[PDB]
Amino acid sequence: ARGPKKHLKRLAAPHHWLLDKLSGCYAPRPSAGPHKLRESLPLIVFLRNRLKYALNGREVKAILMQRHVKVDGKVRTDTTYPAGFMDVITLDATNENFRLVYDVKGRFAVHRITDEEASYKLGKVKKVQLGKKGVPYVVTHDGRTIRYPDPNIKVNDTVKIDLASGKITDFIKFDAGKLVYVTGGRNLGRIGTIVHKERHDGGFDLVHIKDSLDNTFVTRLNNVFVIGEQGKPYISLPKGKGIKLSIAEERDRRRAQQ
Amino acid sequence: STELTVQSERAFQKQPHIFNNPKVKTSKRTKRWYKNAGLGFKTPKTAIEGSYIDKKCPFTGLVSIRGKILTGTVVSTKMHRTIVIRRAYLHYIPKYNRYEKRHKNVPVHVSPAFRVQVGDIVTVGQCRPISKTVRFNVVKVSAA
RNA sequence: UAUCUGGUUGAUCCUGCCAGUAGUCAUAUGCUUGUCUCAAAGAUUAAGCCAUGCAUGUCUAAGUAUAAGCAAUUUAUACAGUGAAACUGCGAAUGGCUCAUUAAAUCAGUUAUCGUUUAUUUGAUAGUUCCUUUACUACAUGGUAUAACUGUGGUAAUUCUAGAGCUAAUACAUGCUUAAAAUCUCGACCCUUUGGAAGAGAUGUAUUUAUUAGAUAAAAAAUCAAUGUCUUCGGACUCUUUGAUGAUUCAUAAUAACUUUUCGAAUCGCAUGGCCUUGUGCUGGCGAUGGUUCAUUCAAAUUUCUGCCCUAUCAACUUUCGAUGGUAGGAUAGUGGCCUACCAUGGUUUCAACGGGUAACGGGGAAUAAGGGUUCGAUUCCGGAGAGGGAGCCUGAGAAACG
RNA sequence: CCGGUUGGCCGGUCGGAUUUCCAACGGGGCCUUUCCUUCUGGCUAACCUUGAGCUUGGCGAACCAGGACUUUUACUUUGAAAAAAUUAGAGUGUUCAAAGCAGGCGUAUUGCUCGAAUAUAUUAGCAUGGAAUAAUAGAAUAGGACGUUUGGUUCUAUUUU
RNA sequence: GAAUUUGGACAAACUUGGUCAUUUAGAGGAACUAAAAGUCGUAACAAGGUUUCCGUAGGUGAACCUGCGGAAGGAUCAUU
RNA sequence: AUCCGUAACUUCGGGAUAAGGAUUGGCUCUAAGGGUCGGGUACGAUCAACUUAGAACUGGUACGGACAAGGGGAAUCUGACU
RNA sequence: AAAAAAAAAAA
């Protein structure tokens, strides 16, 4: 109150960080950045709780202070930078390259990749507009402002980017039969190759999607994210590939491979 | 409605930033600005022809409908460019596993485009705060 | 884990209650108490009072350092290692504690901002500022304080202070330096009729006002007011440019002026490199800091819909002096009776208004349960409110701030 | 007519599965007088489209675009959303258990790896299928529906001339 | 560019009354409950010794009496 | 004099100018409230009054400026009243 | 179809 807040308690953050209810009363509040707070990995968690490359935020500060890490090709020596969906990380040491995406459980997964894949990324356009002096520009989900794009690009499309410059290499439009990825909801983590959408002029365009196994569901255009066409994606996927197995077949698979 | 000798008040009521050049002589005796608020609602010929102004009208006034689209029936039209409507409904009390009737009297702004009576069913569209109580505006009527 | 028992009678069967029984992260208490783990804890009555001591301060390679501080660089004679104090910048509005107020108010879930502000981040983003703008100018770069400190003192005392003497900046404070083209205006002069001209000035961004475009379902012809593109001047005519939203006076752009005139780098560290007409010549890297606008993020403020305990031994309430609405204006960051002026007489109510009470902050949830349910919820999370009671206000992005 | 779930010999695999099967079970479509909204477009779709046994050419949704329109609800199915923690609950060594969300596996020399689910979460609000139940409206001093027609009145207007 | 200053809105706090609400004394009065082997009688329970009861009005030391109308919970389910 | 506020009790009519309070000048302005005439088979021209409300300005906080002009309340005995 | 009142309580 009386202004912003700058703390954050445990039990208040998302469940998808998998922070224990024990270990003190607090958790790290993400600082500002391109990605919303309710969906952001940040680096301390990514390193300490997922990767185990560090035990304490002190160790993490030491790492970022010696500048091992970068993000989108940028160092970002902050403990609590918001690392969101699609977000590529590069550790020159270990020659490691990750790409923040989700699994079927909605959790940020550890998707190791190569450098050629690190050299680009996708962005869901959140708007296109005319800047000052008749300049057209766009804005993605990762806060990036980009100028002089293809006029064929409209809202809710996806844009492949150079990641050294902030320039667009390519783009994918929004149409039936396009490969999707989910960002938010009960159906988060799935991939299902759109069958069709519905308008609902006045709010909340909806869309029906069916996975490879014909399991259908419906979600919102705010949550959806297109990555490619039927079959081929433009990126590397993790295990599971957005299928959302049932718990029965899941434990069956565990018992098969135990 | 009833066309009310439009320039009755002290101020000159006009559509702002609508300047009809007197130097040019034409048909279209005055420029009248209007729009279509979407959602399939038909801005009437009465609006596009009439001389009334109504800053608060969604068709010719500088407002914008967004949010909710409700329905009611009219119970009081004694005010100037404003009415009240009764939004009946039922409400579940689970202990008894049944309902009870209820209502809300909701004040809504009306444009001179529509002539209305008590009992006329209407639908309304949310606007910004028009006044202390009016957060809505009339968008269609459904009776006679 | 869908259970009953004793008691009205001389005895009987019922109603009906009393007592009994079980549990309570519901408290207090008596007696007792050897171990391991986990762990609530001045909320209830007095949101009553408070001794004392702590609880928000803070630096790097990278704003300012002659400490008459420490060190020794020895690369250094301007400085250049460390480094108290003080200036500056940020923060101190987060967090933490309590539940007194508060009953459509909070709050929950659910909408909206086409009705608004937003430090910090993150990504983008100023060639246009020499003003008779041909000597008017520092642009290898302009000026003045002032702390800290020296020393003189006041006070009984306070995180009290004055006078006197210096000195710095990302402190204050002005102020220049870069294309070209194109379009407009005026316009000398040649003068023509087809009529043309040299030359001058203006043209960033920001604020304010006004005006214009910001679109379009379909196809052909008749002439003309004037010829327009060029002509084989018959008239070939195309080319013509327009994004988004469900929807705008949207975005954006353009003309005319306005502004007490904003912003457009007089900043700092490390590296010191290339070209030579070898001059302290011209170029040149990786950073930190700072700045306009847009967007984003952190939010904030208002806000739609539905829902809240008990009371009729509260039934009519509001409206004088704002109550419901309209118009215009002021104020606001912004909508709006938020306030003012004028006008109309409206608005709520037996579907319980208004009023009163609460031993009432609301929820998420807790206890107990066959099921339905009843009771509770100050309290480990979210949102509110408050700092002994009230009102007010500077600072700032942000407070009606209370360490 | 179509095709789905259970079944059922077969087990043609070695107590797991097939396919042709008698039945039931639920879904979709067609015709029975049964519009069960269509205007403009394109995929023309499935196409009389047939080239000799895989070819040169049917009807707009099955793909969208926009349009005129378009009786109202209630109820119900599904879906989303209902912050975490709590609740029930899967797995798992806290030495059991309360707990916790960790852990386990190797040649332990270099390392590999499952995870940290799921369900409910009123009511209101959103989207969707149904269309019984209960209400609502329609054409009766027909200013009623179709509409190839027939004047006409008003409104708007691109392409070109 | 300080002291100071006019006017304005916010308006704490005080003074006086007005009202509401909660407790608190109060001579005396009139009830209730309980205790008590008190006094006066015996109104009711049986046809309770005048059958009870209701409403109403009046009266009397007290229960209670009486008048009008009603009821059976009566002491009559009954006289072709 | 204008505005506000008004108890018990009550024969419901009163009590009640209850009680109790505020304001009141002058000057300059504003607003509202009217009449008579004009219209083929919405107005306009003219005329003239005193009433009410409000806003600035001003004064040695004064203003029903002299005159004029009620003291009130709680209770009792008594007679109803004029 | 004159009259005929009262009997502490406890079990």
PDB file of C-alpha atoms (C1' of nucleotides) in Angstrom, chain D:
ATOM      1  C1'   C D   1     -28.460 -46.368 -43.748  1.00  0.00           C
ATOM      2  C1'   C D   2     -23.742 -45.091 -41.249  1.00  0.00           C
ATOM      3  C1'   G D   3     -20.403 -45.898 -37.936  1.00  0.00           C
ATOM      4  C1'   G D   4     -18.934 -46.124 -31.807  1.00  0.00           C
ATOM      5  C1'   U D   5     -19.011 -49.040 -26.438  1.00  0.00           C
ATOM      6  C1'   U D   6     -19.822 -53.549 -24.194  1.00  0.00           C
ATOM      7  C1'   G D   7     -20.054 -58.006 -24.990  1.00  0.00           C
ATOM      8  C1'   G D   8     -19.556 -63.699 -27.769  1.00  0.00           C
ATOM      9  C1'   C D   9     -17.452 -68.323 -30.038  1.00  0.00           C
ATOM     10  C1'   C D  10     -12.400 -67.893 -31.805  1.00  0.00           C
ATOM     11  C1'   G D  11      -7.954 -67.581 -28.152  1.00  0.00           C
ATOM     12  C1'   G D  12      -5.858 -68.542 -34.448  1.00  0.00           C
ATOM     13  C1'   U D  13      -0.850 -65.105 -28.902  1.00  0.00           C
ATOM     14  C1'   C D  14       1.729 -67.514 -25.119  1.00  0.00           C
ATOM     15  C1'   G D  15      -3.687 -65.572 -17.166  1.00  0.00           C
ATOM     16  C1'   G D  16      -2.793 -61.026 -22.707  1.00  0.00           C
ATOM     17  C1'   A D  17      -5.604 -59.786 -28.158  1.00  0.00           C
ATOM     18  C1'   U D  18      -7.983 -60.096 -32.967  1.00  0.00           C
ATOM     19  C1'   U D  19     -11.178 -59.719 -36.365  1.00  0.00           C
ATOM     20  C1'   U D  20     -16.110 -61.869 -39.861  1.00  0.00           C
ATOM     21  C1'   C D  21     -20.542 -63.250 -35.636  1.00  0.00           C
ATOM     22  C1'   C D  22     -25.264 -63.813 -33.657  1.00  0.00           C
ATOM     23  C1'   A D  23     -27.553 -59.218 -28.883  1.00  0.00           C
ATOM     24  C1'   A D  24     -27.750 -55.029 -25.812  1.00  0.00           C
ATOM     25  C1'   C D  25     -26.007 -50.361 -25.133  1.00  0.00           C
ATOM     26  C1'   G D  26     -25.623 -45.793 -26.181  1.00  0.00           C
ATOM     27  C1'   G D  27     -24.479 -41.405 -31.173  1.00  0.00           C
ATOM     28  C1'   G D  28     -24.930 -39.288 -36.422  1.00  0.00           C
ATOM     29  C1'   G D  29     -27.465 -38.794 -40.881  1.00  0.00           C
ATOM     30  C1'   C D  30     -31.628 -39.850 -44.795  1.00  0.00           C
ATOM     31  C1'   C D  31     -36.976 -40.516 -46.347  1.00  0.00           C
ATOM     32  C1'   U D  32     -41.782 -40.550 -44.636  1.00  0.00           C
ATOM     33  C1'   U D  33     -46.518 -33.495 -46.674  1.00  0.00           C
ATOM     34  C1'   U D  34     -41.135 -32.424 -42.005  1.00  0.00           C
ATOM     35  C1'   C D  35     -36.773 -24.872 -43.523  1.00  0.00           C
ATOM     36  C1'   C D  36     -33.723 -27.940 -39.970  1.00  0.00           C
ATOM     37  C1'   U D  37     -32.481 -18.625 -41.386  1.00  0.00           C
ATOM     38  C1'   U D  38     -30.181 -17.284 -45.611  1.00  0.00           C
ATOM     39  C1'   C D  39     -27.566 -12.560 -49.443  1.00  0.00           C
ATOM     40  C1'   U D  40     -22.941 -11.616 -51.736  1.00  0.00           C
ATOM     41  C1'   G D  41     -18.052 -14.435 -52.557  1.00  0.00           C
ATOM     42  C1'   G D  42     -14.574 -17.657 -53.387  1.00  0.00           C
ATOM     43  C1'   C D  43     -12.222 -24.246 -51.545  1.00  0.00           C
ATOM     44  C1'   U D  44     -16.471 -25.511 -55.649  1.00  0.00           C
ATOM     45  C1'   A D  45     -17.064 -29.873 -51.850  1.00  0.00           C
ATOM     46  C1'   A D  46     -18.251 -34.837 -51.558  1.00  0.00           C
ATOM     47  C1'   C D  47     -18.223 -33.106 -58.364  1.00  0.00           C
ATOM     48  C1'   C D  48     -23.601 -35.625 -64.224  1.00  0.00           C
ATOM     49  C1'   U D  49     -17.677 -34.677 -63.352  1.00  0.00           C
ATOM     50  C1'   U D  50     -14.901 -41.539 -66.945  1.00  0.00           C
ATOM     51  C1'   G D  51      -9.582 -40.229 -70.152  1.00  0.00           C
ATOM     52  C1'   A D  52      -8.635 -47.016 -71.934  1.00  0.00           C
ATOM     53  C1'   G D  53      -9.565 -49.373 -65.535  1.00  0.00           C
ATOM     54  C1'   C D  54      -6.970 -42.979 -61.040  1.00  0.00           C
ATOM     55  C1'   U D  55      -8.897 -38.491 -65.949  1.00  0.00           C
ATOM     56  C1'   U D  56      -9.521 -32.193 -69.422  1.00  0.00           C
ATOM     57  C1'   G D  57     -15.377 -29.702 -67.116  1.00  0.00           C
ATOM     58  C1'   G D  58     -21.458 -30.867 -61.198  1.00  0.00           C
ATOM     59  C1'   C D  59     -24.880 -27.716 -56.346  1.00  0.00           C
ATOM     60  C1'   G D  60     -20.404 -21.989 -51.516  1.00  0.00           C
ATOM     61  C1'   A D  61     -19.125 -23.729 -45.791  1.00  0.00           C
ATOM     62  C1'   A D  62     -17.147 -29.563 -44.721  1.00  0.00           C
ATOM     63  C1'   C D  63     -12.511 -24.102 -45.222  1.00  0.00           C
ATOM     64  C1'   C D  64     -13.300 -18.930 -43.736  1.00  0.00           C
ATOM     65  C1'   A D  65     -15.008 -13.709 -45.231  1.00  0.00           C
ATOM     66  C1'   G D  66     -18.245 -10.312 -44.517  1.00  0.00           C
ATOM     67  C1'   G D  67     -24.156  -9.324 -44.837  1.00  0.00           C
ATOM     68  C1'   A D  68     -29.850  -9.115 -43.898  1.00  0.00           C
ATOM     69  C1'   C D  69     -31.582 -10.715 -40.264  1.00  0.00           C
ATOM     70  C1'   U D  70     -32.178 -12.370 -36.443  1.00  0.00           C
ATOM     71  C1'   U D  71     -39.112 -13.717 -29.418  1.00  0.00           C
ATOM     72  C1'   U D  72     -37.690 -13.881 -24.630  1.00  0.00           C
ATOM     73  C1'   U D  73     -35.923 -16.474 -20.261  1.00  0.00           C
ATOM     74  C1'   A D  74     -35.524 -20.414 -16.423  1.00  0.00           C
ATOM     75  C1'   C D  75     -33.289 -25.459 -16.314  1.00  0.00           C
ATOM     76  C1'   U D  76     -29.673 -28.965 -17.605  1.00  0.00           C
ATOM     77  C1'   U D  77     -24.755 -31.366 -20.053  1.00  0.00           C
ATOM     78  C1'   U D  78     -19.815 -30.121 -21.202  1.00  0.00           C
ATOM     79  C1'   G D  79     -15.829 -26.659 -21.078  1.00  0.00           C
ATOM     80  C1'   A D  80     -13.131 -22.726 -19.091  1.00  0.00           C
ATOM     81  C1'   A D  81     -12.435 -19.910 -14.465  1.00  0.00           C
ATOM     82  C1'   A D  82     -12.894 -20.613  -9.100  1.00  0.00           C
ATOM     83  C1'   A D  83      -4.344 -17.874  -6.126  1.00  0.00           C
ATOM     84  C1'   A D  84      -1.765 -20.604  -2.763  1.00  0.00           C
ATOM     85  C1'   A D  85      -1.909 -23.060   1.952  1.00  0.00           C
ATOM     86  C1'   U D  86      -5.922 -26.129   3.905  1.00  0.00           C
ATOM     87  C1'   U D  87      -9.450 -30.553   2.381  1.00  0.00           C
ATOM     88  C1'   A D  88      -9.828 -35.795   0.178  1.00  0.00           C
ATOM     89  C1'   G D  89      -6.118 -38.124  -2.461  1.00  0.00           C
ATOM     90  C1'   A D  90      -1.507 -41.022  -6.061  1.00  0.00           C
ATOM     91  C1'   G D  91       3.599 -42.024  -5.411  1.00  0.00           C
ATOM     92  C1'   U D  92       7.675 -41.683  -2.001  1.00  0.00           C
ATOM     93  C1'   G D  93      11.595 -43.703   4.329  1.00  0.00           C
ATOM     94  C1'   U D  94      10.444 -38.726   8.004  1.00  0.00           C
ATOM     95  C1'   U D  95      13.754 -45.522  11.624  1.00  0.00           C
ATOM     96  C1'   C D  96       7.078 -45.980  11.950  1.00  0.00           C
ATOM     97  C1'   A D  97       3.620 -41.929  12.458  1.00  0.00           C
ATOM     98  C1'   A D  98       2.291 -36.970  12.561  1.00  0.00           C
ATOM     99  C1'   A D  99       5.165 -34.663   9.115  1.00  0.00           C
ATOM    100  C1'   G D 100       7.865 -33.290   4.523  1.00  0.00           C
ATOM    101  C1'   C D 101       8.108 -33.284  -1.328  1.00  0.00           C
ATOM    102  C1'   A D 102      11.521 -35.416  -1.554  1.00  0.00           C
ATOM    103  C1'   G D 103      14.183 -39.421  -3.610  1.00  0.00           C
ATOM    104  C1'   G D 104      16.013 -43.755  -6.286  1.00  0.00           C
ATOM    105  C1'   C D 105      19.763 -46.297  -9.640  1.00  0.00           C
ATOM    106  C1'   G D 106      24.939 -47.418 -11.327  1.00  0.00           C
ATOM    107  C1'   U D 107      30.922 -50.379 -12.618  1.00  0.00           C
ATOM    108  C1'   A D 108      29.630 -45.017  -6.961  1.00  0.00           C
ATOM    109  C1'   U D 109      36.165 -44.136 -10.636  1.00  0.00           C
ATOM    110  C1'   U D 110      33.320 -39.828 -14.951  1.00  0.00           C
ATOM    111  C1'   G D 111      27.649 -40.075 -13.574  1.00  0.00           C
ATOM    112  C1'   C D 112      21.927 -41.857 -15.137  1.00  0.00           C
ATOM    113  C1'   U D 113      16.923 -40.963 -13.681  1.00  0.00           C
ATOM    114  C1'   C D 114      11.177 -40.895 -12.184  1.00  0.00           C
ATOM    115  C1'   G D 115       9.159 -36.775  -9.945  1.00  0.00           C
ATOM    116  C1'   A D 116       6.877 -32.807  -7.087  1.00  0.00           C
ATOM    117  C1'   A D 117      -0.077 -35.536  -9.993  1.00  0.00           C
ATOM    118  C1'   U D 118      -5.248 -35.576  -9.563  1.00  0.00           C
ATOM    119  C1'   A D 119     -10.316 -34.286  -7.574  1.00  0.00           C
ATOM    120  C1'   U D 120     -13.917 -30.739  -5.091  1.00  0.00           C
ATOM    121  C1'   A D 121     -13.842 -25.664  -4.657  1.00  0.00           C
ATOM    122  C1'   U D 122     -21.163 -22.782  -3.652  1.00  0.00           C
ATOM    123  C1'   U D 123     -23.807 -18.786  -5.981  1.00  0.00           C
ATOM    124  C1'   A D 124     -23.183 -14.888  -9.954  1.00  0.00           C
ATOM    125  C1'   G D 125     -20.850 -14.011 -14.691  1.00  0.00           C
ATOM    126  C1'   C D 126     -18.577 -16.358 -19.983  1.00  0.00           C
ATOM    127  C1'   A D 127     -18.896 -20.102 -24.206  1.00  0.00           C
ATOM    128  C1'   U D 128     -21.266 -24.496 -25.976  1.00  0.00           C
ATOM    129  C1'   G D 129     -25.136 -29.173 -27.029  1.00  0.00           C
ATOM    130  C1'   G D 130     -30.104 -30.333 -25.666  1.00  0.00           C
ATOM    131  C1'   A D 131     -34.830 -28.826 -25.982  1.00  0.00           C
ATOM    132  C1'   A D 132     -38.775 -32.505 -21.903  1.00  0.00           C
ATOM    133  C1'   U D 133     -40.580 -29.572 -17.913  1.00  0.00           C
ATOM    134  C1'   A D 134     -42.786 -24.082 -16.341  1.00  0.00           C
ATOM    135  C1'   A D 135     -43.703 -19.470 -18.005  1.00  0.00           C
ATOM    136  C1'   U D 136     -43.443 -15.727 -22.545  1.00  0.00           C
ATOM    137  C1'   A D 137     -44.651 -13.649 -27.869  1.00  0.00           C
ATOM    138  C1'   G D 138     -46.998 -14.143 -32.470  1.00  0.00           C
ATOM    139  C1'   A D 139     -51.852 -13.249 -38.027  1.00  0.00           C
ATOM    140  C1'   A D 140     -58.560 -11.305 -36.073  1.00  0.00           C
ATOM    141  C1'   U D 141     -61.903  -3.744 -36.090  1.00  0.00           C
ATOM    142  C1'   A D 142     -55.593  -8.506 -40.210  1.00  0.00           C
ATOM    143  C1'   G D 143     -51.672  -1.410 -40.838  1.00  0.00           C
ATOM    144  C1'   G D 144     -50.827 -10.231 -41.513  1.00  0.00           C
ATOM    145  C1'   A D 145     -46.583 -14.047 -44.738  1.00  0.00           C
ATOM    146  C1'   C D 146     -44.612 -15.257 -48.969  1.00  0.00           C
ATOM    147  C1'   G D 147     -43.170 -12.563 -54.205  1.00  0.00           C
ATOM    148  C1'   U D 148     -41.235 -14.331 -60.231  1.00  0.00           C
ATOM    149  C1'   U D 149     -44.500  -9.620 -60.920  1.00  0.00           C
ATOM    150  C1'   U D 150     -46.341  -4.407 -61.730  1.00  0.00           C
ATOM    151  C1'   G D 151     -46.042   1.705 -61.158  1.00  0.00           C
ATOM    152  C1'   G D 152     -43.972   4.785 -57.852  1.00  0.00           C
ATOM    153  C1'   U D 153     -41.729   7.860 -53.296  1.00  0.00           C
ATOM    154  C1'   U D 154     -37.416   8.515 -50.375  1.00  0.00           C
ATOM    155  C1'   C D 155     -32.126   7.293 -49.179  1.00  0.00           C
ATOM    156  C1'   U D 156     -26.983   6.001 -50.596  1.00  0.00           C
ATOM    157  C1'   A D 157     -23.476   5.233 -54.202  1.00  0.00           C
ATOM    158  C1'   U D 158     -18.400   2.713 -56.810  1.00  0.00           C
ATOM    159  C1'   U D 159     -16.825   1.782 -61.739  1.00  0.00           C
ATOM    160  C1'   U D 160     -16.082   4.408 -65.691  1.00  0.00           C
ATOM    161  C1'   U D 161     -17.282   8.119 -69.272  1.00  0.00           C
TER     162        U D 161
END
